[PDB]
């Protein structure tokens, strides 16, 4: 195929000017979309607190309004999804992935208004769920919307404007431009065949999206953890132990969400009334736990710098980790709209911290900061549950800016991906799409 | 498809364990080797340094002993590549890209020794060529070698172990693990068809190689500038104008590296004696420039921090660029083993610093520091001429640790890879492979 190759080489990277200008406009929208989505999730969580104060004397009443405020806002989001766009429950990354395999439809006239307001209901109640779930899905559909609107043709701009939407979709949820671009390339793109995703466009999408997010969010960082110690060569072997620890736990977690989807599906059987009622109960718990023990609830971004600074006991770190596994499963297996990405950062941090602590006290010739081991294990559950290790590495890099730790961070992950492969683990996203395509053909 | 897809998904990321255990061994060997190349290269620059001592008095004698010291090491490399391995002259990355396509020969019994000692002559004699040309080539040839040694079969194992070796080999030339994997992904893979290259194995590959470098190269960084200032939002538009200047100069430089490959060839016309002799006048000139203007010769890393900290004048920058533009061509268009990747980092840093200095005197109200435009322009030639911005950006970020500039950096990189497209430039590593397959059926 020599002459075929020579001609194609001479013709590489000539994305059509129309596609690059549309990545610019998909980006900008996905940005404003996510910025608005974040600003919203905040204003609700605030009004939630302000009610606990109008009622701060009657401590039983206190726990009452904490439960019902979140139960109400949860049910709203549960209802809005199956009363409207169903494929908008849970993460939505499985679907946008599917939509790049051409197996799942981008119902943007429905998903746009169901994910965004349904998300605001679950997230804005303080459920254990990330912004990236909605923003990624919403961003893709926004890419589709501008596709159907401007009627562009070809597989290049369909898959491209689909990608740069969900890329800009994930940039804007972590102010992590590089992690967005990479998410497409490692995890999101169609994994069994070649593709026409114009990467240069995905960038213009990510750029414009991140610039919008900087416009509304600068001078404060999502996670400030400051500069921690370095890692001596003789220490690396402890991070390659940590990966193994995550490599065997990553898949065990995958099984639960699946088995928990099932075990929670048997609660409502499909009935929109039992299901919504159930979601209000979950959300109410999360609003209560958010008052009575905030580490077991919410998005987890708040307790990450606390865990790193060695400011949590081992007793606590275990407690936090048990409960936040419990409330993560209740929140994402039940299918409430929102990602199980950003809570998977926390669970890993709360683990690396626990290991750093035992690693500090067993080897003082090493002179350990327990916080290096949380930063390794932040993107560790990502490598061993969803098996996109290169993206959790550049994500963690971008949020925390401790580049020195590059080796134990890439060493731990390889540890986690490889033991997860070797202990029969399936990538959490694609394990969901299959159960979804097997359900879209197991009724005939 | 859906049934196929349901079956293919439920069976994803399951690289053969043998492919994995063997990837760890490739990087181990691509690492020890890679380190060995760099220890050699300095050790001879040392001799050139330590020989300029014994004859430091007859100022004409000194000029020429630095000429001849490097003139001699210059020629030794031109020969060891013509005599025993012709595909090992120059970069070698085109070649490894070629091999993955199944379109070129992996002669490891021949290239590993030719490149290793060949480049020591052009790198240790003071030439304008990075350690990256040899290290990635050697790294893959090493990867082929253990696929032959252990006799594993298939397209997957041949493409994985050829690839990781090229990644574990670009890391170990820049202490750049991420930009190692991201080179495979963004630039070196078969770019028009799917491949079975296992990333999880291309990753293990770079862990082991990186570890080998940190064991010999630790507590000393290759470019150290510290923490520069942040970049306001109202200033980001300047980083686009920078990227546009790179976007138009990106191609024009590509003309010059291809065109001059043709014209240095007319000098010799394929005569191994007319050619080695021409390249020891190049190398003799480069050991002699590395004494009068250490900034206009050598890898170029030395001037980058001096460049970034605004320590040059506007004139000296103007000079240093025109000079390095020149001294870069002559060294790689002559086909002497060693990359153009690194001497472009230098070219870019120099360029942006010139751009910042303008900015600083035009906008006192932005309170600018020209070094941020250096860091933006450092990977800018890489984005604009070999057209790999994602790897270029992540490379510079891995070597300068100025992540608060990640936005102005991505904006200059896109601003180059875009305007190179709208004018007339091509990925140089696939314009080489193009012209080199254009004579393999001519």
């Amino acid at each position, epitope marked *: 195929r020599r002459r075929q190759l020579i001609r194609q080489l001479l013709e590489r990277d000539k994305t059509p000017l129309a596609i690059l200008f549309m990545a610019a406009v998909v980006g900008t929208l996905v940005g404003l979309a996510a910025v608005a989505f974040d600003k919203g999730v905040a204003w609700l969580q605030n009004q939630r607190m302000g009610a606990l104060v109008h009622t701060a004397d009657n401590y039983p009443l206190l726990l009452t309004v904490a439960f019902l405020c979140s139960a109400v806002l949860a049910m709203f989001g549960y209802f809005l999804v199956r009363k409207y766009a169903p494929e908008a429950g849970g993460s939505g990354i499985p679907e946008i992935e599917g939509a790049l395999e051409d197996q799942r439809p981008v119902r943007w006239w429905r998903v746009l208004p169901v994910k965004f307001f349904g998300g605001l209901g679950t997230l804005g109640g303080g459920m254990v769920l990330g912004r990236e779930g909605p923003t990624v899905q919403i961003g893709g559909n926004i890419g589709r919307m501008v596709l159907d609107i401007f009627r562009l043709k070809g597989d290049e701009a369909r898959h491209t404007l689909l990608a740069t939407g969900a890329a800009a979709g994930l940039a804007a949820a972590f102010n992590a431009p590089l992690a967005g671009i990479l998410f497409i390339i490692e995890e999101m793109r169609p994994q069994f065949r070649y593709t026409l995703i114009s990467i240069k466009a995905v960038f213009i999408g990510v750029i414009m999206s991140t610039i919008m997010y900087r416009i509304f969010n600068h001078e404060v960082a999502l996670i400030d953890v400051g*500069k921690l110690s370095d890692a*001596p*060569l*003789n*220490t690396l072997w402890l991070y390659l132990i940590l990966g193994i620890i995550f490599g065997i736990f990553g898949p065990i977690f995958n099984k639960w969400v699946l088995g928990m989807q099932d075990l929670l599906h048997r609660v409502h059987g499909g009935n929109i009334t039992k299901w919504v009622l159930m979601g209000g109960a979950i959300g109410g718990l999360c609003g209560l736990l958010g008052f009575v023990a905030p580490a077991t609830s919410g998005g987890g971004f708040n307790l990450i710098p606390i865990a790193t600074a*060695g400011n949590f006991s081992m007793g606590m770190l275990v407690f936090i980790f048990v409960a936040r596994v419990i409330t993560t499963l209740l929140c994402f297996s039940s299918g409430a709209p929102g990602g199980i990405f950003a809570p998977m950062l926390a669970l890993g941090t709360v683990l690396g911290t626990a290991f750093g602590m035992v690693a*500090v006290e067993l*080897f*003082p*010739q*090493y*002179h350990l*900061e327990a916080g290096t081991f949380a930063i390794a294990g932040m993107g560790a559950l990502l490598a061993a549950s969803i098996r996109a290790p290169l993206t959790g590495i550049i994500l963690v890099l971008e949020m925390t800016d401790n580049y020195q730790l590059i080796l134990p961070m890439i060493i731990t992950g390889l540890g986690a991906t490889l033991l997860a492969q070797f202990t029969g683990g399936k990538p959490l996203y694609s394990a969901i799409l299959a159960r979804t395509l097997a359900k879209q053909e197991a009724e005939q | 498809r859906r049934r196929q897809l349901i079956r293919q998904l439920l069976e994803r990321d399951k690289t053969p364990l043998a492919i994995l255990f063997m990837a760890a061994v490739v990087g181990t060997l691509v690492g020890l080797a890679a380190v060995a190349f760099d220890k050699g290269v300095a050790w001879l620059q040392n001799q050139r340094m330590g020989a300029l001592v014994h004859t430091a008095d007859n100022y004409p004698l000194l000029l020429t002993v630095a000429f001849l010291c490097s003139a001699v090491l210059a020629m030794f490399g031109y020969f060891l590549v013509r005599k025993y391995a012709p595909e090992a002259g120059g970069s070698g990355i085109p070649e490894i890209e070629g091999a993955l396509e199944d379109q070129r020969p992996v002669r490891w019994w021949r290239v590993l020794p030719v490149k290793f000692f060949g480049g020591l002559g052009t790198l240790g004699g003071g030439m304008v060529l990075g350690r990256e040309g040899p290290t990635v080539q050697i790294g893959g040839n090493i990867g082929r070698m253990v696929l032959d040694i252990f006799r594993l079969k298939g397209d997957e194992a041949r493409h994985t172990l050829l690839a990781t070796g090229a990644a574990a080999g670009l890391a170990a030339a820049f202490n750049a693990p991420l930009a190692g994997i991201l080179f495979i992904i963004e630039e070196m893979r078969p770019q028009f068809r799917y491949t079975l290259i296992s990333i999880k194995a291309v990753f293990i590959g770079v862990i082991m190689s990186t570890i080998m470098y940190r*064991i010999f190269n*630790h*507590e000393v960084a290759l470019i150290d500038v510290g923490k520069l200032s942040d970049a306001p939002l109202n200033t980001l538009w300047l980083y686009l104008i920078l990227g546009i200047i790179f976007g138009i100069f990106g191609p024009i430089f590509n003309k010059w590296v291809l065109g001059m490959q043709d014209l240095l060839h007319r000098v010799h016309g394929g005569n191994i004696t007319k050619w080695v002799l021409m390249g020891g006048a190049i190398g003799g000139l480069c050991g002699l420039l590395g004494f009068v203007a250490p900034a206009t010769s050598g890898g170029g890393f030395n001037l980058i921090p001096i460049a970034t900290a605004g320590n040059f004048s506007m004139g000296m920058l103007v000079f240093i660029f025109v000079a390095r533009v020149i001294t870069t061509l002559l060294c790689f268009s002559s086909g002497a083993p060693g990359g153009i990747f690194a001497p472009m980092l230098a070219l870019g840093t120099v360029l942006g610093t010139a751009f910042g200095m303008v900015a600083v005197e035009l906008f006192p109200q932005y309170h600018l520091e020209a070094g941020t435009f250096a860091i933006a322009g450092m990977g800018a030639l890489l984005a604009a001429s070999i057209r790999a911005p994602l790897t270029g950006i992540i490379l510079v970020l891995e070597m300068t640790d100025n992540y608060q500039l990640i936005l102005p950096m991505i904006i200059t990189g896109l601003g180059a890879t875009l305007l190179a497209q709208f004018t007339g430039g091509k990925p140089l590593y696939s314009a080489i492979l193009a012209r080199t397959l254009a004579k393999q059926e001519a």
Partner: antibody
Amino acid sequence: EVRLLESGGGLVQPGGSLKLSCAASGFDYSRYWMSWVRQAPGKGLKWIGEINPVSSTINYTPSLKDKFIISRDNAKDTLYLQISKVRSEDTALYYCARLYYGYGYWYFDVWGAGTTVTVSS
Amino acid sequence: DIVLTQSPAIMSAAPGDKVTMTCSASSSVSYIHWYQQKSGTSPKRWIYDTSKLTSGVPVRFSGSGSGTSYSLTINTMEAEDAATYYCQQWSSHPQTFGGGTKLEILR
């Protein structure tokens, strides 16, 4: 230059107390573990203790508890050592060091000139 | 903990001459550091990791060894090399210095 300038060592009666002070100049005094190391006359070097930049883990040699107190005043760029219940055994030349590592087996990177502590009635 | 016992407690030798002292260990030890003390100066870190001359350390110096036994060595020593050479480990914890070795000129 990188300078450790320690002071505070003179005559003290037995069973007393003193506060050794090491003043740093030439580098970022945080980001570094600091360490004290004393040397009885005509004898070996002995390790007292160390303290990590955030004062969060302070380590001493197998010798009681209240005996030694290491603290650091990152703000003032100064490392402190309090010896309590001073014996004649504690009569020695007290060194101030800054800790680094190589392959991660740690070492005493830069020392200061010293101060002399004489314990006699 | 981990005792260090340096072997030629005092010693002399002429200039331009090969000198060799010895650190030893009650248990097993990895990567040992040497410091040079001249009477009245701060101990200078001399040698580390059991194989890493510090900056400015003249090349005539050297160190070798394994597990518990290691050793310093001067292939041709001038005068400035006369001082005291303290080995110290931090393979294990807590760390330990050795008693010393006084290097004196012979004349």
